[PDB]
Design a binder for this molecule. Structure first.
Ligand SMILES: OC[C@H]1O[C@@H](O[C@H]2[C@H](O)[C@@H](O)[C@H](O[C@H]3[C@H](O)[C@@H](O)[C@H](O[C@H]4[C@H](O)[C@@H](O)[C@H](O[C@H]5[C@H](O)[C@@H](O)[C@H](O)O[C@@H]5CO)O[C@@H]4CO)O[C@@H]3CO)O[C@@H]2CO)[C@H](O)[C@@H](O)[C@@H]1O
Ligand SMILES: OC[C@H]1O[C@@H](O[C@H]2[C@H](O)[C@@H](O)[C@H](O[C@H]3[C@H](O)[C@@H](O)[C@H](O[C@H]4[C@H](O)[C@@H](O)[C@H](O)O[C@@H]4CO)O[C@@H]3CO)O[C@@H]2CO)[C@H](O)[C@@H](O)[C@@H]1O
Ligand SMILES: *[C@@H]1O[C@H](CO)[C@@H](O)[C@H](O)[C@H]1NC(C)=O
Ligand SMILES: *[C@@H]1O[C@H](CO)[C@@H](O)[C@H](O)[C@H]1NC(C)=O
Ligand SMILES: [Co+2]
Ligand SMILES: [Co+2]
Length: 434
């Protein structure tokens, strides 16, 4: 797709700190850009939509190539249309915003310039950030993660995409998402099937795969840390059900691991560590600091800070595994106790290390789940299982929670605020900001 300018594109600025092993941090100035799926896609020569509701224009988009040729992505009114605002080192995303039409959340990428994404090499470094999840009830997910996306949004590899990072193109993740309207400079109209429950969405014949480091997926009830390896490290297109993931019938018939080696303290047995109020170690009604370290062995460490008190990731005992570090022994023990082979089938942490060794783009989003109501994160899943089933209970939310239409109606003013991002060598982000 190309870019159009009926509506100006002004990326909300966002600063972050780059820290050094020497003990000092220096402020960096970037900005955020919303994913292309949220935008108005219209004809290059008029205001006629190429996509509207849950269907593509049969005339403007008779096939993937013709569609990309005739269509362009336009600018976004961040605050008024998408409820996305920034202030210094803080970024806030509202759940439901009402303008000409209704909008639910957003998926944003941190930029290096107005036309390129910022890339981060996680291996040997640590990433720190503050987050307020107080306004995130059951069924919602304020996520902060990294994916192996191209810095230009795919423009160099696919010339028919001239919109680029400036218009949030090029997304990919471990689900090999097939809901994306444009992949590899072509539309996804071929094989398009509208969603049963989401008026704005559908599933196309193509998906976009790549490694994903889910640093944070959480609400005020539950939180999870999850690395997801793929046989192909970076962005790569996939065909239909061979994509696997959430958008396919068979989630494991692809190149990426859709489950990952997840670490949810509650799921692992510590039901008193993270939650709303003073009865939890970390009180989710208040802002907290989350630090994630990627040691060169490929293992991942984690600690939190709230009110000046530091807490390492709680210890967990699963099978023969015991400790608080997410390493090979943990991931293997998890598959043994909870079940599954997706993570190891895709290469485990060794394969995942190939992603953290290279550059990855920072993503910040707020979403509700039209496929599983976020039950996998904060409730019992599958819903017919009990606490006797290993790993089934992940949170205290009712198995009836998270219906998108219900939560959007009941908690429209829900939101998430990510702030004070700091990145640098392990042991450096806790030093004074510049
Ligand atoms: O009035 C302006 C202009 O509006 C045009 O219509 C727009 C409308 O303004 C937008 O609000 C709307 O935005 C929705 C997208 O259409 C839809 O694709 C997207 O779908 C989300 C889904 O809701 C969400 O659950 C899913 O979550 C992912 C997370 O983002 C990731 O972080 C996580 O890892 O994985 C989950 C699961 O995949 O993401 C998908 C997108 O990939 O939801 C948007 C918000 O509701 O788009 C409309 C266009 O389709 C209108 O056409 C113009 O005429 C008008 O001028
Ligand atoms: O894409 C959203 C989100 O997904 C997260 O991954 C989730 C999966 O979405 C979810 O399906 C998965 O649930 C598994 C569970 O982990 C298994 O332990 C369990 O195992 C079953 C087994 O399949 C059966 O054969 C056997 O009879 O019973 C056992 C026990 O019930 O199966 C369920 C699925 O039915 O959990 C994953 C982790 O929460 C990603 O981690 C996240 O990043 C994504 O955003
Ligand atoms: C949960 O983790 C906290 C922090 O490590 C610890 O103090 C507490 O004892 C743990 N509780 C349980 C039930 O494991
Ligand atoms: C839950 O339902 C699934 C699908 O029928 C089944 O495989 C599983 O054994 C059920 N669990 C219980 C505890 O009934
Ligand atoms: Co094809
Ligand atoms: Co270690």
């Amino acid at each position: 797709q190309s870019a159009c300018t009926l509506q100006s594109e002004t990326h909300p600025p966002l600063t972050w700190q780059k820290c050094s092993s020497g003990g000092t941090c220096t402020q960096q100035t970037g900005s955020v850009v919303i994913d292309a799926n949220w935008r108005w896609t219209h004809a290059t020569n008029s205001s006629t939509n190429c996509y509207d509701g849950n269907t593509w224009s049969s005339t403007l988009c008779p096939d993937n190539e013709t569609c990309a040729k005739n269509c362009c992505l336009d600018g976004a009114a961040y605050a008024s249309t998408y409820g996305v605002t920034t202030s210094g080192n803080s970024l806030s995303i509202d759940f439901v915003t009402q303008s000409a039409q209704k909008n639910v959340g957003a998926r944003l990428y941190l930029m290096a310039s107005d036309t390129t994404y910022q890339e981060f090499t996680l291996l040997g470094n640590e990433f720190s950030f503050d987050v307020d999840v107080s306004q995130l009830p059951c069924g919602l997910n304020g996520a902060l993660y990294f994916v192996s996306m191209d810095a230009d949004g795919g423009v160099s590899k696919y010339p028919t995409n001239t919109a680029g990072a400036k218009y949030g193109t090029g997304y990919c993740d471990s689900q090999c998402p097939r809901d994306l309207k444009f992949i590899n400079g072509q539309a996804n109209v071929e094989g398009w099937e509208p969603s049963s429950n989401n008026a704005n969405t559908g599933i196309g014949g193509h998906g976009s795969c790549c490694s994903q480091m889910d640093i944070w997926e959480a609400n005020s009830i539950s939180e999870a840390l999850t690395p997801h390896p793929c046989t192909t490290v970076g962005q790569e297109i996939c065909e239909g059900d061979g994509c696997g993931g959430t958008y396919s019938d068979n989630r494991y018939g692809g190149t990426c691991d859709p489950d990952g080696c997840d670490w949810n303290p509650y799921r692992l047995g510590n039901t008193s560590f993270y939650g709303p109020g003073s009865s939890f170690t970390l009180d989710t009604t208040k802002k907290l600091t989350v630090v994630t370290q990627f040691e060169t062995s490929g293992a991942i460490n984690r600690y939190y800070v709230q009110n000046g008190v530091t807490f390492q990731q709680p210890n967990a005992e699963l099978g023969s595994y015991s400790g608080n570090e997410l390493n090979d022994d943990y991931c293997t023990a998890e598959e043994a106790e909870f079940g599954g082979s997706s993570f190891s089938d895709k290469g485990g942490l060794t394969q995942f290390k190939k992603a953290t060794s290279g550059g990855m783009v920072l993503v910040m989003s707020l979403w509700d789940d039209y496929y599983a109501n976020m039950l996998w994160l904060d409730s019992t899943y599958p819903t017919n299982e009990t606490s006797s089933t290993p790993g089934a209970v992940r949170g205290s939310c009712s198995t009836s929670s998270g219906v998108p239409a219900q939560v959007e109606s009941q908690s429209p003013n829900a939101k998430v605020t990510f702030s004070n991002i700091k990145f640098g060598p392990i042991g450096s982000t806790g030093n004074p900001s510049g």
